[PDB]
A paper describes a structure:
Individual crystals were harvested from the BAL fluid of mev/mev mice (carrying a defective protein tyrosine phosphatase Ptpn6 gene) developing crystalline pneumonia and C57BL/6J-Tg(CAG-Gal10)Bla mice (transgenically overexpressing Gal10 from the ubiquitous CAG promotor, manuscript in preparation), sensitized and challenged with the allergen house dust mite (HDM). We had hypothesized that the crystals obtained from the BAL fluid of C57BL/6J-Tg(CAG-Gal10)Bla mice were CLCs containing Gal10. However, crystallographic characterization of these crystals revealed that they are Ym2 crystals. Native in vivo isolated Ym1 crystals and recombinant Ym1 crystals as well as native in vivo isolated Ym2 crystals and recombinant Ym2 crystals were crystallographically equivalent, sharing the same monoclinic space group (P21) and unit-cell parameters. Moreover, X-ray crystallographic studies showed that a native in vivo isolated Ym1 crystal and a native in vivo isolated Ym2 crystal are structurally similar to each other, which is not so surprisingly as Ym1 (Chil3) and Ym2 (Chil4) are two closely related proteins sharing 95% nucleotide sequence identity and 91% amino acid sequence identity. (C–E) Structural superposition of the X-ray structures determined from a native in vivo grown Ym1 crystal isolated from the BAL fluid of mev/mev mice (C+E) (yellow), a native in vivo grown Ym2 crystal isolated from the BAL fluid of a C57BL/6J-Tg(CAG-Gal10)Bla mouse (D+E) (blue) and a recombinant Ym1 (C) and Ym2 (D) crystal (grey). The low root-mean-square deviations (RMSDs) establish structural similarity. (F, G) Crystal packing of ex vivo Ym1 (F) and Ym2 (G) crystals revealing their crystallographic equivalence. Here we show by ex vivo X-ray crystallography that Ym2 also crystallizes in vivo and that the phase transition of soluble Ym1/Ym2 to crystalline pseudo-CLC states leads to profound immunostimulatory effects on innate and adaptive type 2 immunity. Given these similarities, we assume that Ym2 crystals most likely will stimulate innate and adaptive immunity and act as a type 2 adjuvant, similar to Ym1 crystals, although we did not formally demonstrate this experimentally.
Author numbering: 1 to 374
Write the structure that this text describes.
C-alpha cells in the first residue's frame, strides 16, 4: 500500500507552536511526500516564492535518510482555480510548453513526479471541452515522462492527479477509463463532505452515510465516492483514498441539538493556529477536547464529533483512521493520502499520542516498510 503525505508551504508560517517546517517530517513515515503548491507562469510550472526552493531542498533531503521515499510537486488547488489550466490545455503548443517545463523543473529540483490538482476541469467556469483536453494533457504528459526515462536511462517520473469527491463534478470533468490508463495514481478527494451551505451539522469525511442522508447527500461518504470511481472504470490499485488531518466546525442553532444533522447558524470561528473559519487542524481539536468538549464517536458514519456550548466539530481521529484503513485494505485500494500531514500532531505536544498520531496509525495498519528504514 502507498501512504502519501501532503506538506503545505504555509504550515511553516503558522504562529509559535503551530509552525511546522518540511525538514522536520519523519522520513520513514510515508511512502510519498507531496509539496503543495507550485504555480504557473506563461504555461510553465514555477515556484510561488523563492523561499519554496529552500522547502524543496529540505523536503528532498529527507530522501538521503529514506532512500525509497518519493517526492511529488502538486500544482493547482482550490484557490488557484481552473482558468490557468483551461488556457494551458487549450492548444498543443501550450501543453508542450507545460510538459517540457515540468520535466525540467522536477529534474532540476530533485522531485520524483507531479501531482496535477486542477479544481476542476468542466466546472467553476472551465468549459465542457476541458474534460477531453485534461485527458489529452494527462496522456501526453505520461508519454513525455516515458520518453525522458528511456532517453536518460533513469526511473520514470510519477504522474498523479487529484480526483473530485462530488458526483456532478466527477461527471463533468473526468474521463475515468482514460485517466486510469495514463495516471500512476488518482488521489480521491474524500473530504470537505460537510455540506456547509445546507444549515445542518455534517461530517467532514464519513466512511458511511447517515440513515438521514437523502438524495445527493447519500453519496457524501468515502464508501459511495470510491464505489463511483470503481463502477466508472478506475483501477482499484491506482485509487489513493483521501484522509483529512482536520475537521470542519459549525455554530449550533441550539446547544441542546448537538448531533449530526442538527441546525446550524454559520461555520465555526477560526482556530488560533490554522486561522480559517469553519476549519480546525487535528492538533487544534485535541486542545478543544482538552478544554472540555464532549467527544462522541458516531458508529453509523464511523467518525467522531465534539461539541462545547454552541461550537461543534466533525473530524477524524485514531479510531476513524484505523477503521478506514481496514476498509481500504478490504476494498483492494492502492493506499491513503494524508491531507495535510502538517495538521496531524507533528510535535506530539497537543494530543500527547506521540508524533504524527493519525499518520502513524496508517503507517502501522497499511504495513508501510522501507528497506532503508529498518
Amino acid at each position: 500500500y502507498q501512504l502519501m503525505c501532503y506538506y503545505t508551504s504555509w504550515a511553516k508560517d503558522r504562529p509559535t507552536e503551530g509552525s511546522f517546517k518540511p525538514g522536520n517530517i519523519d522520513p520513514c513515515l510515508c511512502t510519498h511526500l507531496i509539496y503543495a503548491f507550485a504555480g504557473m507562469k506563461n504555461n510553465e510550472i514555477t515556484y510561488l516564492s523563492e523561499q519554496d526552493l529552500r522547502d524543496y531542498e529540505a523536503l528532498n533531503g529527507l530522501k538521503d535518510r529514506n532512500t525509497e521515499l518519493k517526492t511529488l510537486l502538486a500544482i493547482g488547488g482550490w484557490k488557484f482555480g481552473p482558468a490557468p489550466f483551461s488556457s494551458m490545455v487549450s492548444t498543443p503548443q501550450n501543453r508542450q510548453t507545460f510538459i517540457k517545463s515540468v520535466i525540467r523543473f522536477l529534474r532540476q529540483y530533485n522531485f520524483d513526479g507531479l501531482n496535477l490538482d486542477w479544481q476542476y476541469p468542466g466546472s467553476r467556469g472551465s468549459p465542457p471541452k476541458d474534460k477531453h483536453l485534461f485527458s489529452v494533457l494527462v496522456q501526453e504528459m505520461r508519454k513525455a515522462f516515458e520518453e525522458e526515462s528511456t532517453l536518460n536511462h533513469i526511473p520514470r517520473l510519477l504522474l498523479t492527479s487529484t480526483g473530485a469527491g462530488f458526483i456532478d463534478v466527477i461527471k463533468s470533468g473526468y474521463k475515468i477509463p482514460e485517466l486510469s490508463q495514463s495516471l500512476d495514481y488518482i488521489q480521491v478527494m474524500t473530504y470537505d463532505l460537510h455540506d456547509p451551505k445546507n444549515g445542518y451539522t455534517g461530517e467532514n469525511s464519513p466512511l458511511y452515510k447517515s440513515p438521514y442522508d437523502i438524495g445527493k447527500s447519500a453519496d457524501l461518504n468515502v464508501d459511495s465516492i470510491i464505489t463511483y470511481w470503481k463502477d466508472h472504470g478506475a483501477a482499484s490499485e491506482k485509487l489513493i483514498v483521501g484522509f483529512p488531518a482536520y475537521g470542519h466546525t459549525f455554530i449550533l442553532s441550539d446547544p441542546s441539538k448537538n448531533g449530526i444533522g442538527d441546525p446550524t447558524v454559520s461555520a465555526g470561528p477560526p482556530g488560533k493556529y490554522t486561522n480559517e473559519q469553519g476549519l480546525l487542524a487535528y492538533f487544534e481539536i485535541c486542545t478543544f477536547l482538552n478544554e472540555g468538549a464532549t467527544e462522541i464517536f458516531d458508529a453509523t458514519q464511523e467518525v467522531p464529533y465534539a461539541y462545547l456550548g454552541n461550537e461543534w466539530v466533525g473530524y477524524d481521529n485514531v479510531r476513524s483512521f484505523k477503521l478506514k484503513a481496514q476498509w481500504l485494505k478490504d476494498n483492494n485500494l492502492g493506499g491513503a493520502v494524508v491531507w495535510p500531514l502538517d495538521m496531524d500532531d507533528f510535535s506530539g505536544s497537543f494530543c500527547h499520542q506521540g508524533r504524527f498520531p493519525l499518520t502513524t496509525t496508517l503507517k502501522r495498519d497499511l504495513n508501510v516498510h522501507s528497506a532503508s528504514c529498518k
